[PDB]
């Protein structure tokens, strides 16, 4: 994990996100009252970009914490820009560090694929509960996860890739039975499962299109970063989305994304609320795109149809930074109430 | 990190799909069933259990198939389904933490990574030999061998056109970060650069070389006797010399490394027939290891009789012990000694 974040090359990818960058930019400077002459802790500074803007905008002192050797660059960068007298870049895992003082603002960019991937917010919680004074602000102040039924040609690409996978495995076992004389038949099933788990069962990074969304989007979890806790991170949700097309569409899968907001405390508000969304757009991509969850079996669907969804979202056992999505779906026609029930496990890795 | 990959049938599959590698091992066994007829066999890192199966097919008394990964499950089912469970015993664990109901006649295993030495799976085979093999014991393969040879390849252009791309993209990036956001990224121009050279240039590429692309005499850098090879023998120094052949006129663009493996058994129990598995430049024979290429930072002209005096030093990286580093020091001397043109570059295998 920490591995990939130690590359300049990876770090600039993020910095290249104009959408990602504009939001934090405008959140800081359009609200330089949370910063003027205050103390900020930038959580997971990496390049130290967010930690520079805070100083640039009035922060008396800014603790920029980075777990990787990337810290050594955030230093040259904060020093090369003449803010070394404000920003203190400390290398090390925020979980293991002690500060001299409590902090007014915690600023971080902890959001992953589908928001919860990487579980870096667990570090921010630690930082907030250990340091944020009783009256501190947080950037972002709230977050939000969304889901919606979509219609993509990728559903078929991946079924066509699994089918091929399966076509090859059967030539190969024929080959190995002719020469060598070993019969590979009984590993057909395990090679099946391992393959549905990879082309079908595992969420795809896609760049959805507003026109690909075929129902009302649902909010699958709201969040308050001033108050959220790790215990509430593994999450269960039930809601409903309605078809709006002719429909003359099929259910090919579900897309998931997230909202983020810079609003302030209900009591130290933002002069101006800034929103970073990843909702599909014809123009604004993010490096997060959306997570497409592909349909093992596409389904016909008409307008007015009513998709009752039951999501359950737990962090994996092998690796707590990966997700596993349990998705139960009872579809109901406009008229109550036929159905097309089914249950599917998707993996965010 | 390492083992993770081998728990994948799809991967185990790639290797089993490698005809050259299979033909070699399959023949090694059946052309020599005299080591296997009624013998006890240890297979180290069984995977699908393919070597265990053949051994048992060749009349072994009992076979021992050790896999670290949950793949042991499938070798175990793969051996039941071929009516060999009464001879083959698939065990789950590391050959380092496992004990045996007895000593073993033959130790067969496919432990060779990229450029022979990657993954360092031989450490496990050794351990397996030292504790379990009996004096009489034979080993498959019985010898190994790493080679090196100066080459001519358009990939040394491909990568530097790649690097330049990278650099160009950065200088725009930084200019775009200053225009909006008001940060100058200048102090990171050099570090960015080194990362990009470390990654495009100094890092070994997989390649499938044509024998024509070999512009000098090859050279043996290391030769291995699996019966006696130590783990300390595994960090390696090698000073060779090579002579440019094509050399009417070509360009030095980098180096290729590859390995040989041999199944000759023992001098007091020799193979009825010796089998070989080579990864040299082929024209008609491919392998999943291919050849490892080490690019020239800067390509150099070269002629007939030009003498490449190479100083090599193979060692493992501090971070991971399964990865390699190669300090390659090069003195080039024209057929008329000298004058020179000497360089020094450390290459990473990952
Ligand atoms: N517990 C922890 N302590 C310190 N740094 C952490 C951390 N968990 C994640 N990080 C770091 O936080 C960074 C998140 S990526 C964000 C980069 C930068 N803040 C920006 O917005 O441009 C990574 O560089 C990662 O190394
Ligand atoms: N110390 C160890 N103990 C058990 N298995 C090991 C091991 N080190 C490596 N392996 C396993 O050995 C295999 C190496 S690839 C060999 C696959 C198979 N024997 C064949 O020849 O086709 C991998 O499955 C790896 O997981």
UniProtKB/Swiss-Prot annotation, chain B:
Record flagged with keyword S-adenosyl-L-methionine: yes
Boundaries of every SAM-dependent MTase PRMT-type domain copy: 1-327
Name under which the protein is recorded: Protein arginine N-methyltransferase PRMT10
Stretches the record annotates as Dimerization arm: 157-197
Signal peptide region: none
Similarity-based family: Belongs to the class I-like SAM-binding methyltransferase superfamily. Protein arginine N-methyltransferase family.
EC primary class: transferase
CDD domains: AdoMet_MTases
Active-site residues, as the UniProt record annotates them: 110, 119
Keywords, sorted A to Z: Methyltransferase, S-adenosyl-L-methionine, Transferase
Top-level lineage group: Eukaryota
Enzyme Commission code: 2.1.1.319
Organism from which the protein derives: Arabidopsis thaliana
Subunit structure: Ring-like homodimer.
Residues bound to S-adenosyl-L-methionine: 12, 21, 45, 67, 96
GO MF annotation list: histone arginine N-methyltransferase activity; protein-arginine omega-N asymmetric methyltransferase activity; protein-arginine omega-N monomethyltransferase activity
Catalytic activity line of the entry: L-arginyl-[protein] + 2 S-adenosyl-L-methionine = N(omega),N(omega)-dimethyl-L-arginyl-[protein] + 2 S-adenosyl-L-homocysteine + 2 H(+)
Function: Methylates (mono and asymmetric dimethylation) the guanidino nitrogens of arginyl residues in some proteins. Essential for regulating flowering time.
InterPro entries: Arg_MeTrfase, PRMT_dom, SAM-dependent_MTases_sf
GO biological process: peptidyl-arginine methylation, to asymmetrical-dimethyl arginine; vegetative to reproductive phase transition of meristem
PANTHER family linked: PROTEIN ARGININE N-METHYLTRANSFERASE, PROTEIN ARGININE N-METHYLTRANSFERASE PRMT10
